[PDB]
Amino acid sequence: VARGWKRKCPLFGKGG
């Protein structure tokens, strides 16, 4: 979605 959707996925993998 933004930029954090790479390593420290803030929302990408919020769950796991």
What is the Cα 9 distance to its own chain's centre? Answer: 2
Residues 6+ apart with CB under 8 A from 5: 11, 12
What is the Cα 13 distance to its own chain's centre? Answer: 5
Distance CA 13, CA 5 (A): 8
Burial class of residue 14, CB neighbours in 10 A (0-12, 13-18, 19+): exposed
Kindly state the tokens that stand for 2: 């933004």
Residues 6+ apart with CB under 8 A from 12: 1, 4, 5
SS3 15: coil
Kindly state the tokens that stand for 15: 């769950």
**Hunting for tokens 């979605």 — which residue is that?**
1
Torsion of CA 10, 15, 13, 16, to 10 degrees: 130
Cβ atoms of 1 and 11 closer than 8 Å: yes
Cβ atoms of 11 and 5 closer than 8 Å: yes
